[PDB]
């Protein structure tokens, strides 16, 4: 698609986007935050150490 | 016999020219529904339809 900016390429470009969609954007949080939301229960010491 | 003469001349020329041109264009699209290949075809910013 990089070569040309015409309508001939956007068709199959959107088709391939349907085939394989890349990640457009994502919200993020530190990795120590997911430890609080685990089934293992309280992990405050390990969470603070990793923070 | 006495002879005397005097001559004087002056010329002044000033020229000024200014030219300024500006043109811009903007485009905003907001489409919701059917994000398939056809709407990507229609997402062509240059052609209007
Ligand atoms: C895209 O391809 C068409 C067909 O070859 C061509 O006419 C057009 O000029 C191209 N667009 C460019 C080079 O920006």
Say if CB B43 and CB B29 are below 8 A apart: yes
Looking at chain B, how many residues does it have? 49
Distance in angstroms (rounded) separating the CA atoms of residues B40 and B49 = 12
Q: What are phi and psi of A7, to 5 degrees?
A: -75, -10
Using the Cβ of A34 and the Cβ atoms of chain B, whether some distance falls under 8 Å is answered with no
Experimental method: cryo-EM
Say if CB A13 and CB A1 are below 8 A apart: yes
Of B36, B39, B47, the CB nearest to A7: B47
Please, what is the Cα angle at B9 between B3 and B11, to 5 degrees? Answer: 175
Sign of the dihedral through C-alpha A2, A7, A10, A12: negative
Of B37, B43, B47, the CB nearest to A18: B37
Nominal resolution (angstroms): 5.6
Using the Cβ of A38 and the Cβ atoms of chain B, whether some distance falls under 8 Å is answered with no
Using the Cβ of B31 and the Cβ atoms of chain A, whether some distance falls under 8 Å is answered with no
């Amino acid at each position: 698609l990089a070569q040309n900016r015409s309508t001939i390429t956007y068709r199959s470009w959107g088709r391939s986007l349907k085939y394989n969609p890349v990640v457009i954007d994502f919200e993020m949080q530190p990795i120590h935050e997911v430890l609080r939301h685990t089934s293992l229960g309280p992990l405050e010491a390990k969470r603070q150490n990793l923070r | 016999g006495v002879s005397v003469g005097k001559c004087r001349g002056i010329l002044n020329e000033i020229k000024d020219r200014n030219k300024r041109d500006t043109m811009v264009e903007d485009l905003v699209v907001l489409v919701r529904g059917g994000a398939s290949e056809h709407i990507t075809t229609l997402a062509y910013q240059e052609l209007p339809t």
